[PDB]
Structures are given as structure tokens and as C-alpha cells.
Motif scaffolding. Structure first.
Motif, PDB file in Angstrom:
ATOM      1  N   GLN A 198       0.817  -1.205   0.000  1.00 17.59           N
ATOM      2  CA  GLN A 198       0.000   0.000   0.000  1.00 17.59           C
ATOM      3  C   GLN A 198       0.856   1.262   0.000  1.00 17.59           C
ATOM      4  O   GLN A 198       2.000   1.271   0.449  1.00 17.59           O
ATOM      5  N   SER A 199       0.259   2.351  -0.477  1.00 17.59           N
ATOM      6  CA  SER A 199       0.917   3.652  -0.464  1.00 17.59           C
ATOM      7  C   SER A 199       1.077   4.167   0.970  1.00 17.59           C
ATOM      8  O   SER A 199       0.492   3.642   1.926  1.00 17.59           O
ATOM      9  N   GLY A 200       1.889   5.229   1.110  1.00 11.69           N
ATOM     10  CA  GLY A 200       2.287   5.726   2.408  1.00 11.69           C
ATOM     11  C   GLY A 200       1.205   6.527   3.136  1.00 11.69           C
ATOM     12  O   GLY A 200       0.141   6.836   2.617  1.00 11.69           O
ATOM     13  N   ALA A 201       1.499   6.844   4.391  1.00 13.74           N
ATOM     14  CA  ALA A 201       0.597   7.646   5.209  1.00 13.74           C
ATOM     15  C   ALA A 201       0.283   8.974   4.526  1.00 13.74           C
ATOM     16  O   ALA A 201       1.097   9.516   3.777  1.00 13.74           O
ATOM     17  N   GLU A 202      -0.925   9.484   4.767  1.00 10.26           N
ATOM     18  CA  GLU A 202      -1.407  10.693   4.116  1.00 10.26           C
ATOM     19  C   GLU A 202      -2.038  11.620   5.137  1.00 10.26           C
ATOM     20  O   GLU A 202      -2.690  11.168   6.082  1.00 10.26           O
TER      21      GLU A 202
ATOM     22  N   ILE B 201      -5.825   6.376  -2.346  1.00 10.69           N
ATOM     23  CA  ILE B 201      -4.777   5.507  -1.828  1.00 10.69           C
ATOM     24  C   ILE B 201      -4.793   4.223  -2.647  1.00 10.69           C
ATOM     25  O   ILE B 201      -5.784   3.889  -3.307  1.00 10.69           O
TER      26      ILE B 201
ATOM     27  N   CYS C 257      -3.054   0.074  -3.629  1.00 12.21           N
ATOM     28  CA  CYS C 257      -2.714  -1.265  -3.148  1.00 12.21           C
ATOM     29  C   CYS C 257      -2.258  -2.071  -4.362  1.00 12.21           C
ATOM     30  O   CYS C 257      -3.067  -2.347  -5.245  1.00 12.21           O
TER      31      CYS C 257
ATOM     32  N   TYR D 151      -6.818  -0.882   5.217  1.00  8.29           N
ATOM     33  CA  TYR D 151      -6.141  -2.086   4.758  1.00  8.29           C
ATOM     34  C   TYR D 151      -6.783  -2.571   3.465  1.00  8.29           C
ATOM     35  O   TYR D 151      -8.009  -2.549   3.322  1.00  8.29           O
TER      36      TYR D 151
ATOM     37  N   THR E 224      -2.619   1.788   5.435  1.00  6.50           N
ATOM     38  CA  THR E 224      -2.336   3.187   5.139  1.00  6.50           C
ATOM     39  C   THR E 224      -3.078   4.053   6.137  1.00  6.50           C
ATOM     40  O   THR E 224      -4.308   4.003   6.199  1.00  6.50           O
TER      41      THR E 224
ATOM     42  N   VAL F  22      -4.594   7.410   7.327  1.00 10.24           N
ATOM     43  CA  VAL F  22      -5.104   8.649   6.744  1.00 10.24           C
ATOM     44  C   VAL F  22      -5.477   9.593   7.877  1.00 10.24           C
ATOM     45  O   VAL F  22      -6.162   9.188   8.823  1.00 10.24           O
TER      46      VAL F  22
END
Lengths: 213, 220, 194
Positions: free
Chosen positions: B6-10, B20, B22, B95, B116, B118
Motif C-alpha cells: 500500500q501507499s504511504g501515510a497521508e 490511496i 494497493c 487495509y 495506510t 489517513v
């Protein structure tokens, strides 16, 4: 519109105890129920699928049983790494519904914390604020009292605490308490002390320093 | 090995849009349903919906009316969850999960993404300042790093670049009255090593692109 | 009067896909919840409607088509698909309105020696039109040599048997398929929910 329930909402057991938790569905869902384990800071992990099938690579102390509206999940011999929230999960041809979770904690022999105190750093002082930190390391149970006394004056409302999740190996906790003071307020006093009480301490334990080494 | 990344924290302001992602690897992405699962702060898991990447067929949970939309890009083995206009209540962990093969009627999530985080907030992103927690100078000594005044979550802390793990305790962040997070990381070491050994905390706050390596020394 | 979905879905015998069966559903009330509340279906996709909103609707000219195909062919039973099944056997229109339901039927449609009773059309001069049914058995000229309606080299009988053995891989196992066709019109509707 399927409501899933679980009981109990939380439990505590010793290593080697047999643990059984339950899941209820608001209607008959045959054996269309799964069980997941979610450790603190991790994605959930599938353990049991279709009510009773052990996922590959999952330790055999875990098991599940039941069908219809009532299901059970069992750890036959609770291990230290088993601290987590356990979720049941119904499914059908369209989607899924998770149960609300059962949090599992471990009981162990009482262990007193080892206490450490840290003065603020000069680098932070230069910036106008002072953090004094008290560390209570590797104790059990989770309940511990920390009292900041500055020149024997009990402090209030100027500190925050943080507690780790239970350790996955030795089942203890650790706790940090931070007293935040302006630089001027920090200089008003000399003796900074953190007084600790805990079930494993027959008498309170105090850690202190004097402002200026 | 089957993997979901998954992409990073936002961190976003209310009303902004967000997508986001996956990305699946190690299996045939178009043959398995991908689900999205929400975990509210302190709450349990909630199934949001699932998509078949071969035709982008979507089943949504009855709860989620039309706030967040699920999609997938076959060509790059990627599934997406997106908001046209974020609200405060979208602050959560998300998730993705691989579900059943299209041939299989038995639903279960056998592999999961790492999650991730958010944050929906109007407050400004701020990198932390890192201060040493210096040893006394027993047998065992404690030292650490104070990671103070940052927003949003999360931060990661390691010691000696991840080589030092034994005795490490990184506490959950506390929200201060200023609205800023603070966090401590401590490690217990032999007192006899304080004189000669090197202890460095590696702090990374990706939302602010702040990375700090702080050598922690006994106070002179 | 409850709609006879059980006799469509629980029919003891299913048709071969090339000779797909169709039944009209009329003048009855339909509870689709019995479908989507189960987890017996490996495919349950609706087009132009949401499956959980089916009971709230009334329909005109309901149809239920059913047949057996291979597991890894079920994705062809959808709008805008191609392949041997979608091209030569059973073709849905791009604007399809209805639901496609499938489930693994290995237990009923496989046999220790191999079940060869289920057929599909392997060869055809052109693709089927939507909802077209082709049961012809003329010899197919697959090559340069004329056939003159005689089986021989490059001249094939156009239908071939699936081979359903219980130990086949799941993608090679038989799946039963029901396609429910709906029309949602400003017109009288004899099929409604509870």
C-alpha cells in the motif's frame, strides 16, 4: 443486515491456559465464518476459515468450531505472542461482516518496574521549554502510579503518560511520564523527582536529579 | 510470494480529494477479489467493499453509501480507494486484502497490505525536533530520544539503523494540548558501554520529509 | 405465488451450454434474498441493478437461462466478453440488465470415468448474436479442403464434449450457471418482490 457479536470483549489468561471465545450471528450462516488475529501495529491475520479449517502455517494450538448462529475459537495453550484482538468474520456471496473483536491479554507473575529519570536536554532548554522524563521499565501488571514532586511539591496537570502494548515475549509493560515546564518554571526549582508505586513495590520508589548536574 | 503493498501515510485538509493504492504481486491479480477494510481510531475492523479486478465489478458494504469509491487498474496490478471530498470521520487506518479466487465461493482474506494511515485535519504538517534522553553517569542504563511537537502521525524510530532492537521501547505518541504529538523511544544498555559505545536514534517523519539521526551521549 | 426459482436453481439436470435452457418467469412474487444470503455461489453479479435492491423492484419479461460450462469460462457470461463460450455458445448483450449466478457443480456433474454428456460448440463461421441459440450440427470446414457435408481431414463435427473428472483442477470442473434477464420499463410488471 447481519449483526455479529463476540464474547467476552476482553480477557486475561496465563501462559499455557486454554482460552475459548465465542461469536454469534443474528441469523443462521451455516459454517460461513472466519477468525482473524490482529496484533498491535499489524494487519489482521487469518487463522481459521469456514468455522474450523486451520490456515496453512498457523500453529495448531488454534482451532474453531460451531455452525449456524454460534461459533467458538479456542487457543488450547496460550502463548506470550498470542496477545491480540481476535475477530470473527461472516461472509456470503456478496461480502463480509466482521465481529466486534475480543482483546486477549496475558497474566503473569507480578514484576516491579525499574525506574529511570532524565533531565531536559540543553538543546531543548535553549528553545525555551523543558521536558523531564520518567521511565518505568518492564513491569506487570499495567497499573502503576507516578507522582512528580518538585522541591517536594506534588505536581498536577502538567504531565502526560504513555504505556506500551504488552510485550510479546515477557508479557510486561513499560511507561513514560513527561513533565512539561517552561524554561523559567524549570529554573524556579532544584529537586525534580518521580515517585513510583506499583503492586510489585512494597514501598514507593523515587528517582531524582538536581537541576545542574 | 503473494504480496499487497500500500501507499504511504497521508494527511489532507477537509474537502480535499485523496486516492490511496494497493499493488498486488506474486499472483494473478485479475483472478482474486480485493477488499478494503477500515479501522477507526481505537475501533474494530469494518469491511467497506470489494472489487473484481478483471471487470471492476464492485460489491460495497451496505453502510458505505457513496462516500469512498473503490477502483482497480488491471494494467499495473493495482486497486484504489478514493474520496472526492474528505471529512474528519475519514481519519482511520485502511487495509487492502486479497479475498477469494473468482472460482471459489469461500470468502476469506489470506493476504493483507501493510495498512495506510489517513489523517484528515486542517492543522499544518510539522516535523519533530529530536532531543536526547541522556543516561545517569545497577548494571543496566537507560537512554533514549524525545521526538517532540510533530503532526500528523506516524513517526518511526529505530536505533543504530535498525541493528539495535533488544531492549527498545518506542511509546505510543501522546497528543499534547498544543494539538501536537510527542513520542519517546528508550533502550536499556549495559552501564559499562556508555563510555565507549555509540547509540543513535533514527527518527523519520515522512509527512514532513524530516529524518534525524541523533547520537545520544551521557551528559558531561 | 412465489416465483419458481428453486426449480431453475435446483433442477436435477442442466442443459449443455450450446443448447442453453430458458424459462420465463411471470405472474409471481420473488424473494431474491434466498440467493444472496447464501455463500454457495462463486459468481453473483448484477447489471443495471444492485443485488440487494432487487426485492424493491418490479420487472417486465423475466427470463432465467441455465446451463453448464467450465469454471474458467464463467467470466465470459458477462456483457462485452469474448471467447469460445461468448462467441459460439451463449452471448450476453452489452446492455444486459439482469444477474449472472454461478456455482461449482463438481459433486453433481463430474464422474469417476469422466462425464462427457456436457457439450459446447467448438467451431462456427461467425459469432452469435446476443441471446442467439445455435443447435445445428453441420460439418465445419476448418481448412482449405472442401467437406461436402462429410467428416474428414480438417472437416469437423462442430460440438465437443467437456471432460469432467472429479480430480480436475477447479478451473476445469463443471459450474452451473443461471442468467436472470430483467426489463425495467414504464409498463405493467408481473414480477415484484416481497
Amino acid at each position: 443486515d447481519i449483526v455479529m457479536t463476540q464474547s467476552p470483549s476482553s480477557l486475561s489468561a496465563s501462559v499455557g491456559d486454554r482460552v475459548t471465545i465465542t461469536c454469534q450471528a443474528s441469523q443462521d450462516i451455516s459454517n460461513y465464518l472466519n477468525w482473524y488475529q490482529q496484533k498491535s501495529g499489524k494487519a489482521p491475520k487469518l487463522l481459521i476459515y469456514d468455522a474450523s479449517n486451520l490456515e496453512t502455517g498457523v500453529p495448531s494450538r488454534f482451532s474453531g468450531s460451531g455452525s449456524g448462529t454460534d461459533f467458538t475459537f479456542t487457543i488450547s495453550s496460550l502463548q506470550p505472542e498470542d496477545i491480540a484482538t481476535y475477530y470473527c468474520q461472516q461472509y456470503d456471496s456478496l461480502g463480509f461482516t466482521f465481529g466486534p473483536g475480543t482483546k486477549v491479554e496475558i497474566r503473569r507473575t507480578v514484576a516491579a518496574p525499574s525506574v529511570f529519570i532524565f533531565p531536559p536536554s540543553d538543546e531543548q532548554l535553549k528553545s525555551g521549554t523543558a521536558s523531564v522524563v520518567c521511565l518505568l521499565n518492564n513491569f506487570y501488571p499495567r497499573e502503576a502510579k507516578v507522582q512528580w514532586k518538585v522541591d517536594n511539591a506534588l505536581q498536577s496537570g502538567n504531565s502526560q503518560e504513555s504505556v506500551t502494548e504488552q510485550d510479546s515475549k515477557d508479557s510486561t509493560y513499560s511507561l513514560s511520564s513527561t513533565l512539561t515546564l517552561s524554561k523559567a518554571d524549570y529554573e524556579k526549582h532544584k529537586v525534580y523527582a518521580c515517585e513510583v508505586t506499583h503492586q510489585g513495590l512494597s514501598s514507593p520508589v523515587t528517582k531524582s536529579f538536581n537541576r545542574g548536574e | 510470494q503473494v504480496q499487497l503493498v500500500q501507499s504511504g501515510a497521508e494527511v489532507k485538509k477537509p474537502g480535499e480529494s485523496l486516492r490511496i493504492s494497493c499493488k498486488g504481486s506474486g499472483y494473478s491479480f485479475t483472478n482474486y477479489w480485493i477488499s478494503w477494510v477500515r479501522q477507526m481510531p481505537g475501533k474494530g475492523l469494518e469491511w467497506m467493499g470489494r472489487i473484481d479486478p478483471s471487470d471492476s465489478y464492485i460489491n460495497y458494504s451496505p453502510s458505505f453509501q457513496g462516500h469512498a469509491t473503490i477502483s482497480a487498474d488491471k494494467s499495473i496490478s493495482t486497486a484504489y480507494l478514493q474520496w472526492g471530498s474528505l471529512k474528519a470521520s475519514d481519519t482511520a487506518m485502511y487495509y487492502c486484502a486479497r479475498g477469494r479466487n473468482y472460482l471459489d465461493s469461500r470468502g476469506r482474506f489470506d493476504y493483507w497490505g501493510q495498512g495506510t494511515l489517513v489523517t484528515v485535519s486542517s492543522a499544518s504538517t510539522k516535523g519533530p525536533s529530536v532531543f536526547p534522553l541522556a543516561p545517569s553517569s545497577g548494571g543496566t542504563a537507560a537512554l533514549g530520544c524525545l521526538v517532540k511537537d510533530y503532526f500528523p502521525e506516524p513517526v518511526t524510530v529505530s536505533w543504530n539503523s535498525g541493528a539495535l532492537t533488544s531492549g527498545v521501547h518506542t511509546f505510543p505518541a501522546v497528543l499534547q494540548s498544543s494539538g501536537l504529538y510527542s513520542l519517546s523511544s528508550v533502550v536499556t544498555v549495559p552501564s559499562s558501554s556508555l563510555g565507549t559505545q555509540t547509540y543513535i536514534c533514527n527518527v523519520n517523519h515522512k509527512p514532513s520529509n524530516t529524518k534525524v539521526d541523533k547520537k545520544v551521549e551521557p551528559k558531561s | 405465488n412465489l416465483c419458481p426459482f428453486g426449480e431453475v436453481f435446483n433442477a436435477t439436470r442442466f442443459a449443455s451450454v450450446y443448447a442453453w435452457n430458458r424459462k420465463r418467469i411471470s405472474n409471481c412474487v420473488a424473494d431474491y434474498s434466498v440467493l444472496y444470503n447464501s455463500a454457495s455461489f462463486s459468481t453473483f453479479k448484477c447489471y443495471g441493478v444492485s443485488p440487494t435492491k432487487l426485492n424493491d423492484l418490479c420487472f417486465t419479461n423475466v427470463y432465467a437461462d441455465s446451463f453448464v460450462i467450465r469454471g474458467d469460462e464463467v467470466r465470459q457470461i458477462a456483457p462485452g466478453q469474448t471467447g469460445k463460450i461468448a462467441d459460439y455458445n451463449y452471448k450476453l448483450p452489452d446492455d444486459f440488465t439482469g444477474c449472472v449466478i454461478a456455482w461449482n457443480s463438481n459433486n453433481l456433474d463430474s464422474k469417476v470415468g469422466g462425464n462427457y454428456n456436457y457439450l459446447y460448440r467448438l467451431f462456427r463461421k461467425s459469432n452469435l448474436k446476443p441471446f442467439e441459440r445455435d443447435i445445428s450440427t453441420e460439418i465445419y470446414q476448418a481448412g482449405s479442403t472442401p467437406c461436402n457435408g462429410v467428416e474428414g481431414f480438417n472437416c469437423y463435427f462442430p460440438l465437443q464434449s467437456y471432460g469432467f473428472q472429479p480430480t480436475n483442477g477447479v478451473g476445469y470442473q463443471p459450474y452451473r450457471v443461471v442468467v436472470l434477464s430483467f426489463e425495467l420499463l414504464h409498463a405493467p410488471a408481473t414480477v415484484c418482490g416481497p
